[PDB]
Design a protein around this nucleic acid. Structure first.
Ligand SMILES: [Mg+2]
Ligand SMILES: [Mg+2]
Ligand SMILES: [Mg+2]
Ligand SMILES: [Mg+2]
Ligand SMILES: [Mg+2]
Ligand SMILES: [Mg+2]
Ligand SMILES: [Mg+2]
Ligand SMILES: [Mg+2]
Ligand SMILES: [Mg+2]
Ligand SMILES: [Mg+2]
Ligand SMILES: [Mg+2]
Ligand SMILES: [Mg+2]
Ligand SMILES: [Mg+2]
Ligand SMILES: [Mg+2]
Ligand SMILES: [Mg+2]
Ligand SMILES: [Mg+2]
Ligand SMILES: [Mg+2]
Ligand SMILES: [Mg+2]
Ligand SMILES: [Mg+2]
Ligand SMILES: [Mg+2]
Ligand SMILES: [Mg+2]
Ligand SMILES: [Mg+2]
Ligand SMILES: [Mg+2]
Lengths: 173, 242, 96
RNA sequence: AUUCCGGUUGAUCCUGCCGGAGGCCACUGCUAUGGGGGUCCGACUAAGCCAUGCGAGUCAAGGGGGCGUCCCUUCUGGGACGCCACCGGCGGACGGCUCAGUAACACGUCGGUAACCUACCCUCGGGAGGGGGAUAACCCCGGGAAACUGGGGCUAAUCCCCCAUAGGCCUGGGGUACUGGAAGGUCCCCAGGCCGAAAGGGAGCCGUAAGGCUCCGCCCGAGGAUGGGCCGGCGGCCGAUUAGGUAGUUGGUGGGGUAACGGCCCACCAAGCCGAAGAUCGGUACGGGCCGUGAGAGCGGGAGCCCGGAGAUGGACACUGAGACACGGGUCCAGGCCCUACGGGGCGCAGCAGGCGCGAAACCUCCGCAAUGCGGGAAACCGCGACGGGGGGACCCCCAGUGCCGUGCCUCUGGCACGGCUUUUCCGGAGUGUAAAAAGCUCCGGGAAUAAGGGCUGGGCAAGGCCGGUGGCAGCCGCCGCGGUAAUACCGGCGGCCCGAGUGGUGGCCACUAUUAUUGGGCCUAAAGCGGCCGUAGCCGGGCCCGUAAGUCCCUGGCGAAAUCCCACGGCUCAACCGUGGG
C-alpha cells in the first residue's frame, strides 16, 4: 500500500463565499487580532474535536468508555475551559470564544501586561514574556490554568524595570 | 533470502519482547543461535548497554565483555550476540549483584534482583526424554541443554517436571512433579506472569495440546496451555518471584 | 554563573565517575569549557588532568545549561577508553 | 454541515442529464523573508544505451620467504623490531537496486512433515595412534602488440593422500527399554555386507632441566537453536460477439530418481479427470500490512516505509560450496558495442554520483567510518556509496515575520505630521554545538531599519449602475449568456472583494448522485413487463408434538508481527515529531 503522509490539522469552509459566515468571522478576526483565517480555522477544529468526542461517549458503554470519559473531563478542566464540578453534558455548550480566550496573546492583554492586543502580540514575539520561568514566543499557545498566575515580564527584558518609558505608559491605563 | 541465510535485522522487525526504541536507528543486533529461542531471549549487548546502563556505546560495551565481567549461569560469556533468556541468572561479581530474567505482565523481559544464596540454582523444565546408546536416558530441557541419567532412575522423571540444577557444576538437587496442588508460573500467552496452583488437567484427540486450570491467591480460576505452565514449587515457590 | 550538581554515579567496571550538572546564568553567554572544568575541579577537589567534559548544552528560552562530565582514576585507562576526538576537543592531547 | 444552487416554457409542475461549490494526487503560469520535523524527489514513456571513480574484505597467535633497523658475540651467526607479497583459513548466497514476467499454493491466514536438509552457536557423552607427498613464494631462461602464459631448480604448513580404530548406511531374525493422540522412529542381542574421522596444532608464564598451568583451537555421536524446502483447508479481478476441455491426461500395480513425499519420470493395466455454482481460452496486473474520499453503508488506489515473490541485455546450461545454477564468478547461441601490430582479445550501472536518449515530467562526478550494524580477528583494531553528515529542489506537515505606543489632522476602516519604544527577522563579533564543519541555541554592538503577491469584480457567488477606448469587429464565455456607436459582462484607469508566502491553469479518483439504489431507485401516458402459456436447476414456502444440535446466540483457551489509527501523561520553547501505558 502506501506509507504515512502527514495531514493538515484544520478544516476549510465548504463554500468560500457565504455572506453570514463572512460577517461572523470578520467580527472575530478583528476583535482578537489574528493574522489570517487559517489561524481561526485551527481553533475551530479543536472545538469540533472535543464535541465529536463527547457525542461518541454519551452513546457508549463498557470499561474503556468510562476511562475515556473521565480523561476527557480531566483534560477539559485542566485547560481552564470547565469548572471543576462540570459533567459531560456541559461539553456540548462550549463556544469558539471560550477557546480564543485561552490564547497567550489574549491572556497577556487581560492581565494588564500590554495596552492592546497588537502590542501583546509583539511583546510575545520579541521575547519579553515568560511563563513559569520559561520564555515562549508563540502567540497562539494555549495556557493551562495551573500556570496562569506565573506569567510575567522576562527577568532579562528591558520592560522588567518599573522606570522604563514604555512600561510606564502601559501602567497608565 | 533468495540464495541463503539472513544475517541482518531491521529495528522495525525486531521481536516484540525487547525494550528497545524502534525508530531511533535502522539496524538491530541479530542474535546468534544458542540456548533459548527468539521469542524468549535477548542479546547480551542490550542487557549491558540499554538495560543496566554500564556503557554508552557498543564499542565500550564490547571492552567490558572481553575482560570477563559478566557471568550467565556462572560461566563467562564474551559474545555480544549471545542470547539470555527466561529463568537465566546474570551475575556481576565485581559489583556483587545478581538478577533473574523474567517476563513482565505485558510480556516483555525484565531483570529481577535476587540474593546470592538463590543465585546458585536454576530451574529447568523437562521438555523431552529419550533413550541413548548404552541404554541410558537423556533429558532435554526447556533451554536446550541436556543431561544423562541411568536406567535405574528412569521412573523419577517425566515431561513437564521441573529439575532444580546447581550452576555452574550442573548437579541435580531437587525434582518437582507436575500434579494437582503444584505451584506454577505462566510464561507466555494472555495470562503471562500470573501464578498459582494447579486444579485440573484436560486432554483432546488428534494432537491438539492439553490445557490446565489454575487458581490464584484471590480465588480466581484461569486456564492456559500445559506447556506454558512452569512448575516452581510443591505448595510454595522455591525461588523469588515478583 | 552558578553550578549545581544533580547526580554523581560510580562505575566500577569502567573505573570512572559520571557527573551531571546544571549552570544558571541569566544575562550571560554560555560558559566556556575551561571555566566549567576549573569550577568543577575546585568544587570536587579532583585532579584536572584526568577530567573530561562530554558536553555543555543550552536550550531555547532558558537561563540555564545542562552539562555532562566524566572523571577517571587513572590516565592509562582514560587514554584506553575514550575516543581520540573527545580528548582533542577538550585540550587533553594535541592533534597530529 | 446526514445541505444544495444555474440551465428545456410567453408562464407552470415533472422526468432527466450537463455545469457550479469540497478534498487529495501528477504537470504547469506568475510571485516568494525565516526556522523546525519527516518514512519526499528518472515510479508513469525506454527492464533503453552507458566514458571515468568508488560500492567486499580481513587474519603476522596457521606457514616458509624478501627488505630495513638495533643488541651479543660476530670471519659465520643468533636475536629482537617493523614492513611487503605469496601459500593457507573464514567471508563474498547477506546487505543495496528495480517491478519485466506471473491469475499461480505467488500472496494472507490456520494447520502439517511419523516424508526432509542446515557451516557459524549452546549443552552433555567420547577421541586425537602410525606413515607418505607435492607445490606457490624465491633462483635461471623466457614467449606474445596486448589479454595472458611455458620449461628447469629448491621449500613449509592448521595444505594434500594412505593404514588402523571409533563411527555411518542397507537387509534378514529375535527382545519389548522411550516419546507420543497414534510408530515404516529411538534402545538391546545375533547374522551378511558396503562406506569410513581427526591439527595435541598455535601463544604466554613457572620451568636449570624435567614437565605443568592457563588462552585459542581439531574429529565423532545425541539433542536444541538459527535459516530454509515441501504439503493441505479457507480468502481476494474483468469478458459468453470465448461452450465444451484434457490423452502422462485421472487413478491403480511394479520400479527409478531426489535431502525428502509425489505422474516428478518410466514399464504395464484401466477409462477416468474438469465444466453454465462458468471449465477452457483471451484481457489486465507483482501480493499484503496499508492509503485517498465519504455521516455511514460504500466506491477507488496499491511507487517511496516493513514483511513475502521474482530479475540482472533476450534464451538455454554447468563448476565450487553448508547454502547459487551466483548483479561487481564461468560456457554456448542471438543482438549491440570497444581495442588490435590484423594473428587475436574484451564489455552490458534495474549499486552511489555523473552523461546521452525519451518525454509534460525528476538533484552533487561532495565529507566520514565518530553513531547504528555486518564480515574478519584471541584482542587492540581494519573495511563498508549499507548507514550517518551536509549540497540542489514552491515534496508534505508545524511555528513565525514584513513593526508597536501616545497626541493631533484628514475622505476618520485607513492616510499623513510630530514624540517615544522594541529587534523575532537583517549586518558584524565571543561561546556552545559537530568526526571536522555548516545550521541551531545563549550573550554583545548597530538600526524601522532588510521583506507582498495571485486571482476575481452581470447571475450561480463575496465585491462598481464610475470614467476613457472598440463598435456583430476585436474579444469574453466550466454553464446560462455578453458584444449591432449611450457595453455595470470585451481592453485600460481609479475604486472594491477573497485568500495570503502563496495564488491561478490542465488532466485523474472520491463526493455531489437515491444518475447503480443491501440500507435505498424505477417500468399506464416520460427510458423500461418477454405476443401468450407449460415446465428443469435455483430462490421462497401452512398448523401442532417429539428428537438432534449443522446455522444462530453466550462464556472461555491459542492466534491474526512492527510501523500506521484514537486517548491520557511525560521529552525536545509549545507544536509537528519521539517515548511509557490503555484501546
Ligand atoms: Mg506494493
Ligand atoms: Mg418541454
Ligand atoms: Mg523509486
Ligand atoms: Mg528507466
Ligand atoms: Mg543476493
Ligand atoms: Mg507489469
Ligand atoms: Mg579410514
Ligand atoms: Mg492488485
Ligand atoms: Mg543522478
Ligand atoms: Mg516534478
Ligand atoms: Mg476592469
Ligand atoms: Mg452579491
Ligand atoms: Mg455531476
Ligand atoms: Mg430515477
Ligand atoms: Mg405482456
Ligand atoms: Mg409489450
Ligand atoms: Mg411455470
Ligand atoms: Mg412453517
Ligand atoms: Mg451450532
Ligand atoms: Mg500490528
Ligand atoms: Mg519543555
Ligand atoms: Mg504535549
Ligand atoms: Mg511512538
Amino acid at each position: 500500500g502506501d506509507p504515512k503522509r502527514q495531514r493538515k490539522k484544520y478544516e476549510t469552509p465548504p463554500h468560500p463565499w457565504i455572506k453570514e459566515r463572512l460577517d461572523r468571522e470578520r467580527v472575530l478576526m478583528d476583535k482578537y487580532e489574528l493574522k489570517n483565517k487559517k489561524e481561526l480555522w485551527k481553533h475551530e477544529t479543536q472545538l469540533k474535536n472535543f464535541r465529536r468526542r463527547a457525542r461518541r461517549l454519551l452513546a457508549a458503554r463498557g470499561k474503556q468508555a468510562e476511562i475515556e470519559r473521565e480523561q476527557l473531563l480531566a483534560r477539559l478542566k485542566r485547560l481552564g475551559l470547565l469548572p471543576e464540578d462540570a459533567v459531560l453534558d456541559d461539553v456540548l455548550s462550549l463556544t469558539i470564544e471560550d477557546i480564543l480566550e485561552r490564547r497567550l496573546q489574549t491572556i497577556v492583554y487581560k492581565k494588564g501586561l500590554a495596552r492592546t492586543m497588537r502590542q501583546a502580540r509583539q511583546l510575545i514575539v520579541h521575547g519579553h514574556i515568560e511563563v513559569n520561568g520559561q520564555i515562549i514566543r508563540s502567540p497562539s499557545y494555549l495556557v493551562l490554568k495551573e500556570e496562569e498566575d506565573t506569567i510575567t515580564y522576562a527577568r532579562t527584558s528591558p520592560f522588567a524595570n518599573p522606570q522604563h518609558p514604555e512600561r510606564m505608559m502601559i501602567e497608565k491605563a | 533470502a533468495r540464495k541463503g541465510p539472513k544475517r541482518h535485522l531491521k529495528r522495525l522487525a525486531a521481536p516484540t519482547s525487547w525494550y528497545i526504541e524502534r525508530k531511533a536507528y535502522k539496524w538491530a543486533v541479530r542474535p546468534r543461535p544458542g540456548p533459548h529461542n527468539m521469542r524468549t531471549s535477548i542479546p547480551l549487548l542490550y542487557i549491558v548497554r540499554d538495560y543496566l546502563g554500564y556503557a554508552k556505546t557498543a564499542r565500550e560495551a564490547r571492552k567490558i565483555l572481553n575482560e570477563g565481567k559478566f557471568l550467565v549461569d556462572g560461566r563467562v560469556r564474551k559474545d555480544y550476540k549471545f542470547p539470555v533468556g527466561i529463568m537465566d541468572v546474570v551475575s556481576i561479581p565485581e559489583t556483587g549483584e545478581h538478577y533473574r530474567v523474567l517476563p513482565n505482565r505485558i510480556g516483555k523481559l525484565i531483570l529481577h534482583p535476587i540474593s546470592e544464596e538463590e543465585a546458585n540454582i536454576k530451574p529447568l523444565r523437562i521438555r523431552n526424554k529419550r533413550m541413548v546408546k548404552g541404554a541410558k536416558i537423556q533429558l532435554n530441557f526447556h533451554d536446550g541443554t541436556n543431561h544423562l541419567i541411568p536406567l535405574s532412575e528412569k521412573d523419577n522423571y517425566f515431561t513437564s517436571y521441573t529439575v532444580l540444577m546447581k550452576v555452574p557444576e550442573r548437579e541435580i538437587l531437587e525434582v518437582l512433579p507436575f500434579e494437582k496442588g503444584a505451584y506454577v508460573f505462566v510464561t507466555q500467552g494472555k495470562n503471562v506472569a500470573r501464578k498459582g496452583r494447579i486444579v485440573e488437567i484436560k486432554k483432546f484427540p488428534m494432537g491438539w495440546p492439553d490445557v490446565v486450570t489454575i487458581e490464584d491467591e484471590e480465588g480466581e480460576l484461569f486456564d492456559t496451555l500445559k506447556e506454558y505452565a512452569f512448575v516452581v514449587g510443591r505448595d510454595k515457590p522455591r525461588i523469588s518471584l515478583p | 554563573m552558578e553550578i549545581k550538581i544533580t547526580e554523581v554515579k560510580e562505575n566500577k567496571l569502567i573505573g570512572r565517575k559520571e557527573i551531571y550538572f546544571e549552570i544558571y546564568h541569566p544575562g550571560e553567554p554560555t560558559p566556556s569549557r575551561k571555566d566549567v572544568k576549573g569550577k568543577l575541579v575546585a568544587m570536587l577537589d579532583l585532579n584536572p588532568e584526568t577530567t573530561v567534559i562530554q558536553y555543555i548544552r543550552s536550550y531555547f528560552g532558558s537561563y540555564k545549561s545542562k552539562g555532562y562530565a566524566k572523571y577517571y582514576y587513572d590516565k592509562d585507562r582514560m587514554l584506553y577508553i575514550e575516543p581520540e576526538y573527545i580528548l582533542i576537543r577538550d585540550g587533553i592531547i594535541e592533534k597530529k
